[PDB]
Structures are given as structure tokens and as C-alpha cells.
From a paper:
Recognition of the foreign or cognate target RNA (CTR) triggers its single-stranded deoxyribonuclease (DNase) and cyclic oligoadenylate (cOA) synthesis activities. The same activities remain dormant in the presence of the self or non-cognate target RNA (NTR) that differs from CTR only in its 3′-protospacer flanking sequence (3′-PFS). The single-stranded DNase (ssDNase) and the cOA synthesis activities reside within the Csm1 subunit and the RNase activity resides within Csm317–19.
Two distinct CTR-bound structures were resolved from two major classes that have 1123344151crRNA1Target1 (CTR-43) and 1122334151crRNA1Target1 (CTR-32) stoichiometry, respectively, where each number corresponds to a numbered Csm protein. Interestingly, unlike previously determined thermophilic Csm structures that prefer assemblies with fewer numbers of Csm3 and Csm224,25, LlCsm prefers the longer CTR-43. In contrast, though no ATP was used in formation of CTR-bound LlCsm, we observed 3′-PFS traversing through Csm1. Four nucleotides, C(-1)′-A(-2)′-A(-3)′-G(-4)′ of the 3′ PFS in CTR make a 90 degree turn from the trajectory of the rest of the target RNA and rests on Csm1. Notably, three helices: α12 of the Palm 1 domain, α17 and α21 of the Palm 2 domain of LlCsm1 point their N-terminal ends towards the phosphate backbone of the 3′ PFS nucleotides, thereby forming a positive groove that interacts favorably with the negatively charged 3′-PFS phosphate backbone in a sequence-independent manner. The 3′-PFS-helix dipole interaction locks the two Palm domains in preparation for Csm1-mediated activities. Four RNase centers are observed in the CTR-43 complex along the backbone of the bound CTR. The 2′-nucleophilic oxygen, the scissile phosphate group, and the leaving group oxygen form the classic inline geometry at each of the four sites. Either an arginine (sites 2–4) or a tyrosine (site 1) residue is situated near the 2′-nucleophilic oxygen that could act as the general base to extract the proton. A large number of particles of the CTR-43 but not those of the other two complexes lacked clearly defined side views of the HD domain, which could indicate a change in the structural property of the HD domain when CTR is bound.
Author numbering: 1 to 81, 91 to 107, 119 to 296
Write the structure that this text describes.
Amino acid sequence: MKIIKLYFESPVHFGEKRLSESKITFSADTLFSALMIEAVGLGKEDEFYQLASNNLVKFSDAFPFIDQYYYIPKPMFNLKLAFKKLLYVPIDSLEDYLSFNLGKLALSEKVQQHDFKDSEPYNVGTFTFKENTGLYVLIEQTHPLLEELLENLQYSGIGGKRNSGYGKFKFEILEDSDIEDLFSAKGNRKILLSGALPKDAELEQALKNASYLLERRGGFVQSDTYATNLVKKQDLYVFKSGSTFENSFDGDIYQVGKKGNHPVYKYAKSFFLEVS
RNA sequence: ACGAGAACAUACGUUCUUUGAACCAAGCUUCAACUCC
């Protein structure tokens, strides 16, 4: 199981509800949406969907990482038992569990001027990473196709505010074996690592002793082909990445657009870190 | 088929107005056109 490390040399804007604020990381269907839009840039979008639909391409979402420390969101248990301010724990320090600051959020103030009229300002929330940090994306069984797409994505930009002028990155794989054995392990409680949602006939079996938050996950369709306007998406509600489940489930790539000239998918497949 | 798409933090605006590098202060003090043969 491989690593995908993302080094940003420019600020990022990962919006979650509005342009004025931003988020440290980006989700999994955000990266999958970027890969779909770039694959239909290359025309190979159909067999990329047939790869990601049949589990050979299965990635988690982005996580913070500092120099030789890979992080995850604080897994949230039914713990009966200060470190309550900390949002991220190192990925190998879960056994110890049972200082940290990457970057700083900034707000960039912009304007749009009209020539024979008064101007109008708008402001963009940004995030800038420190010099020896960034984000990393977990992936198992790397494919030549996704190695080609991320090689091609880095000149289009992950992030929100494009193409002015923020999201750009250079990636490298840099596989690791100190944390592959964590994912080869098996335990009794399995934490989630991506924004996921089980299929309708297994949500009950997935929902037994869980600890989760829903997140709304919608927005606008970003294409020049979906139905001659800016149509919103069917707001899918997926589990938060810092969830825990005692029993596993497998997600689906749900179609959240069913009215334009092409389908709009949303990645909601599961990715577990099994722990005792 | 990225809470996304499109968007100059832009337009206007004299580091400027008033202000003697001035005031006070002897080119002066002491000296033989001279001594010797």
C-alpha cells in the first residue's frame, strides 16, 4: 500500500460552504472529482470510472503531514475516560493513544472593478502550508492511469479558487513500509479514513456501535457540458472521515447528477484503518 | 465532472503650507631705517 504526498508551493482554498472561509485538507470525492474532470480532459474518463467502481483504485482523503509524521483526524471512540484541543493525531500513535501546527489560514481580499461604475469587493479565504509540510493521500495498489492523471493534474490545480491562482502542487509517491503493516493489521474497531456512505441494504449492519458525524456534501457541477447553466448537486450526506465502526462496510460511487448531458459521480467508498 | 464558475482591492488625491544661517566681535598687539668701520 502506497503513499501520495502533495507539496504545495502556493496557497490553497479548500472551501466547504462558502468562498470567504477555507479548510486545511480536502476530501476524497474532491480528489476523485479532480481526477474525473482531468480524465475527461484526456478522454479516458470511462475506464477510469470502471477502475474506481471495481475497487482497484481506492484512496482515502487528504490528511496533514509534517516531516516524517503522517497524521489523521482524531478518531472518536465511545471512550469512557489538555489534549482535548488537538484535532490530529499521528497515524502510528494510536497504540500509544489507548507541537502540531502546519501553516496558518489567511484571508485574501480581492475586488472586481467595472469601468463606468463603482467596484465591488469579494474576499477569498486561503491556507498556506509551511515549508516542510503539506498533505498526503493514502492509496492501495497504485495504477499507471492514476500516476498519469496526477502527473497531469498538477498543472491544472487541486483546490477551489481556480484559475485565479491558488491551487498548485508537485507530487511524488514515496511508498512506506512503517505504516503498511498498520493497514495489514486487523482489530475489533475499524476507523474510517474517507468520506463514505454505505449502500442502502447494509447501512443498518454498518450502523451498530458507530461514532460518526454526517457531513453534507454537495455544491455546483463544474463542467461546460452539464445542462447549459450552474446546476447544484444532489447533496449526498456521507460519514465524516474521523469515524469509527466496529464492523466494516463498503461504499459506492453515487451518481448525484441525473439531469445534465453526462453523469456526475461522487466518491463515497470506505477506507479503514483496523485497530484493536 | 473539485462549495464550484466568472471577478485587477481598484478609482480620486502636490509631503505640502509659514520660516534672513542669523546675532555679537578693530587684522590687531609689541617694534627707532638702524649698527659698524
